[PDB]
Amino acid sequence: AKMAFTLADRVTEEMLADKAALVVEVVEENYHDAPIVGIAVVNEHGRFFLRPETALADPQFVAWLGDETKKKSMFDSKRAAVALKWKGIELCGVSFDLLLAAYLLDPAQGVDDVAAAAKMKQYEAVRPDEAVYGKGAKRAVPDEPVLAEHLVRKAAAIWELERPFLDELRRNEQDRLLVELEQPLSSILAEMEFAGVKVDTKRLEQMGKELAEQLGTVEQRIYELAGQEFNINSPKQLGVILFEKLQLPVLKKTKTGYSTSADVLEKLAPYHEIVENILHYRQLGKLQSTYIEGLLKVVRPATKKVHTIFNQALTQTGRLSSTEPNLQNIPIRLEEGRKIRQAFVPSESDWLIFAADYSQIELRVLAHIAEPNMRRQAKAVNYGIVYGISDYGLAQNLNISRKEAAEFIERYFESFPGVKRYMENIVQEAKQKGYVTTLLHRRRYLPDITSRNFNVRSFAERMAMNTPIQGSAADIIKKAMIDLNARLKEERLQAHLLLQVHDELILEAPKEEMERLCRLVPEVMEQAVTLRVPLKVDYHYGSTWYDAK
DNA sequence: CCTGACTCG
DNA sequence: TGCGAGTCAGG
Numbered sequence: 201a202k203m204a205f206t207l208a209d210r211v212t213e214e215m216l217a218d219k220a221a222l223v224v225e226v227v228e229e230n231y232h233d234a235p236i237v238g239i240a241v242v243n244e245h246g247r248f249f250l251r252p253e254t255a256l257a258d259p260q261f262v263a264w265l266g267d268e269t270k271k272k273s274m275f276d277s278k279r280a281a282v283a284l285k286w287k288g289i290e291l292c293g294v295s296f297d298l299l300l301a302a303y304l305l306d307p308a309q310g311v312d313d314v315a316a317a318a319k320m321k322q323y324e325a326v327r328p329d330e331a332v333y334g335k336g337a338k339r340a341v342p343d344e345p346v347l348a349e350h351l352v353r354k355a356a357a358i359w360e361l362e363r364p365f366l367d368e369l370r371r372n373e374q375d376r377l378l379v380e381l382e383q384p385l386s387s388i389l390a391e392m393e394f395a396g397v398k399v400d401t402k403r404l405e406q407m408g409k410e411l412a413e414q415l416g417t418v419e420q421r422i423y424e425l426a427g428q429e430f431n432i433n434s435p436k437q438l439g440v441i442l443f444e445k446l447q448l449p450v451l452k453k454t455k456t457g458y459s460t461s462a463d464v465l466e467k468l469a470p471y472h473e474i475v476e477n478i479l480h481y482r483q484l485g486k487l488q489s490t491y492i493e494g495l496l497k498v499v500r501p502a503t504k505k506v507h508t509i510f511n512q513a514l515t516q517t518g519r520l521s522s523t524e525p526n527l528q529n530i531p532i533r534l535e536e537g538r539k540i541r542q543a544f545v546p547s548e549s550d551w552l553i554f555a556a557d558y559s560q561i562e563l564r565v566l567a568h569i570a571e572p573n574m575r576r577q578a579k580a581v582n583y584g585i586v587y588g589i590s591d592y593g594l595a596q597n598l599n600i601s602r603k604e605a606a607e608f609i610e611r612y613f614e615s616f617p618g619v620k621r622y623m624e625n626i627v628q629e630a631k632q633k634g635y636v637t638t639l640l641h642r643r644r645y646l647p648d649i650t651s652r653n654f655n656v657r658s659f660a661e662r663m664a665m666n667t668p669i670q671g672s673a674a675d676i677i678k679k680a681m682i683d684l685n686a687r688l689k690e691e692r693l694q695a696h697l698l699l700q701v702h703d704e705l706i707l708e709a710p711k712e713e714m715e716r717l718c719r720l721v722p723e724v725m726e727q728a729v730t731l732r733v734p735l736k737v738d739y740h741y742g743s744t745w746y747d748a749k
Numbered sequence: 750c751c752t753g754a755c756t757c758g
Numbered sequence: 759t760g761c762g763a764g765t766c767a768g769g
């Protein structure tokens with residue numbers, strides 16, 4: 201733990217080498233419009249700390265950041281790229297991202313800072329971010345010499361760790377996954393996050409006003425039916441009303457008490473009408489709390505845009521997630537909630553929203569590898585069965601007899617015996633190897649799969665059945681986004697990606713480009729990979745996200 | 750902060 | 759006793 205570096209007062213030529221480890225430090229978890237608090241550069245010529253005020257106003261440094269021929273190794277280059285966009289600076293030339301490298305090597309390690317990645321290779325000449333900045337109300341940027349040393353140590357670690365990580369990825373056949381898929385995707389997600397999605401706040405606020413009135417009415421109806429006021433949003437208080445006051449059957453308990461889950465309340469409808477009202481209330485209350493109030497809280501007022509963060513190194517299957525706000529769980533399944541999407545509008549006048557979704561991509565992937573309310577329920581049966589639902593679960597979902605449920609499942613595998621063999625085989629392989637893989641060589645380790653405990657082992661077995669299929673579908677749409685943006689640029693279209701929702705891409709564009717997108721977007725998505733079955737994509741466009749159906 | 754609710758693929 | 763996610767109010 202003894203490391204020389206220069207705390208620089210100005211940028212010099214030797215800091216602008218054609219290969220460097222670069223650290224552009226943003227301390228806040230949400231990096232949109234967040235302060236850059238320090239910069240570090242490590243290259244052949246040495247180690248350097250720079251003050252942001254200095255470096256980011258220096259024309260040669262800004263030029264270097266933006267020069268794609270000056271290669272930078274980083275950790276979480278998307279965080280830096282976006283933070284720099286908010287500072288009006290383009291970052292190009294990122295050739296290695298240690299966060300994504302660590303994630304591919306083992307998504308279970310949950311690597312979220314350089315220190316945690318460093319530990320994978322017994323590197324310890326660097327501290328955890330939390331140890332440096334502290335947490336919660338105590339979180340603060342430390343004294344410059346302490347900050348400077350930390351950033352340098354992080355850069356130095358990225359510098360030394362690149363080779364060992366690349367070598368391990370190659371040994372796993374994951375080097376191309378990193379360099380040709382995840383890393384190019386990171387720059388594309390950076391663009392999407394910075395672009396944001398415009399919100400119609402006038403419409404959203406009016407929806408909220410009307411929703412409050414409706415909640416009040418439903419609320420009073422429930423109190424009338426129950427014969428008492430109580431907090432409906434407390435499962436504990438609700439349980440007392442349902443199972444003690446009204447004396448309804450107790451169908452399920454959890455560790456804290458009586459279950460009031462939606463599945464349970466639906467099953468209680470033959471006993472008391474109040475349960476349907478409560479389900480409605482809890483639906484409405486989530487709309488109001490999360491998709492009206494919560495969404496308005498994160499709208500940037502001057503532009504009316506919301507800027508999500510797509511976490512690229514979180515899920516265990518290779519999917520993305522979306523936070524603050526989550527734009528991947530906006531309501532669509534019931535018309536009442538679906539109307540929320542009318543509030544998501546194009547960012548320019550005379551533009552339109554365009555949405556394209558793969559149809560049953562996971563089921564097509566499985567076929568390749570293995571060789572309205574009714575239809576909504578039928579989807580859960582299809583995915584449920586292939587992913588290992590039991591007769592109990594299926595019976596409970598269709599409210600049918602366990603005997604009947606067992607016959608459906610038997611008959612299902614009768615129709616698709618190759619799916620059956622595959623699921624048996626993939627489980628045995630996971631037990632032998634200790635991991636499963638996707639089409640593009642993404643990996644998930646499953647060390648619980650030989651467990652002597654039934655529950656623990658069974659969960660791992662079902663991960664073996666599910667992760668390769670869900671993860672392959674993730675691999676595919678990731679490749680489609682890369683291929684799609686290349687085509688957009690090639691044709692000089694103004695259209696651009698706004699969102700990915702697992703098997704869906706959401707774009708905005710001038711109305712004039714709608715005809716071209718109707719051909720281009722589905723073509724690119726369908727051709728991202730060639731399976732033994734065709735990939736099918738549906739697409740629609742309209743004045744709001746709601747109308748793009 | 751955890752649990753159980755509602756939300757999506 | 760299908761799987762992958764995030765946010766919220768209540769306690």
Ligand SMILES: Nc1nc2c(ncn2[C@H]2CC[C@@H](COP(=O)(O)OP(=O)(O)OP(=O)(O)O)O2)c(=O)[nH]1
Binds near residue numbers: 558560561579584761
């Ligand atoms: N993608 C996916 N969806 C699941 C899973 N489990 C339940 N579902 C539900 C929620 C979303 C829905 C998926 O829709 P699909 O793409 O399979 O079918 P679709 O015919 O294309 O949908 P649509 O009615 O819009 O045309 O099924 C799962 O493991 N993966």
